[PDB]
Design a protein around this ligand. Structure first.
Ligand code: HEM
Length: 154
């Protein structure tokens, strides 16, 4: 919501580890999101037709879209909260086109945290998790504000 410089540094230190295998992370993140919250899968006309985890893992379009997620998220995180300009095209498309409730951003946030733990068991401790949770919460809160700015949501 306002992160210390130390929390931002933790977030960016973890993000460098995402950026080492963006495709792997983005794929895992989307797969965890879809398994943990199947209702979010129905939002994706391109993916609605993927059922087992093994099918999702073989979908190169799913992998590609994971990259799209994480590169966009990464650009935002690197702004360390000064992300107003980067949020609006995202808020605009997710509020008005894809028509995504903020609650779904909470689900993918949990999916990010979970995947970071499974891919970096030793690098992603309690500190880094707190910082990343805070950064993603700030992201969600700011996206929520941008929804309301566009006249949408709760
Ligand atoms: C960290 C959170 C997220 C980020 C950074 C993100 C980013 C993006 C980006 C960059 C695109 C492509 C351009 C666009 O349509 O805006 C996209 C498309 C899309 N997003 Fe997200 N997204 C996030 C969370 C979610 C969630 C949780 C859902 C649904 C449960 C969702 C649903 C969609 C859909 C349906 C599309 C269109 C994809 C397609 O064309 O097949 N997004 N997202």
């Amino acid at each position: 919501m306002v992160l210390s410089e130390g929390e931002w540094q933790l977030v960016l230190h973890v993000w460098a580890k995402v950026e080492a295998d963006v495709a792997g992370h983005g794929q895992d993140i989307l797969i965890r999101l879809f398994k943990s919250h199947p209702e979010t899968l129905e939002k994706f006309d391109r993916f609605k037709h993927l059922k087992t985890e093994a099918e999702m893992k073989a979908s190169e379009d799913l992998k590609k879209h994971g990259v799209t997620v994480l590169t966009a998220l990464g650009a935002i995180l690197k702004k360390k909260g000064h992300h107003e300009a980067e949020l609006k095209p995202l808020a605009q498309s997710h509020a008005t086109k894809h028509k995504i409730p903020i609650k779904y951003l909470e689900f993918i946030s949990e999916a990010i945290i979970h995947v970071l733990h499974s891919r970096h068991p030793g690098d992603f401790g309690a500190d880094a998790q707190g910082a990343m949770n805070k950064a993603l919460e700030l992201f969600r809160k700011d996206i929520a504000a941008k929804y309301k700015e566009l006249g949408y949501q709760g």
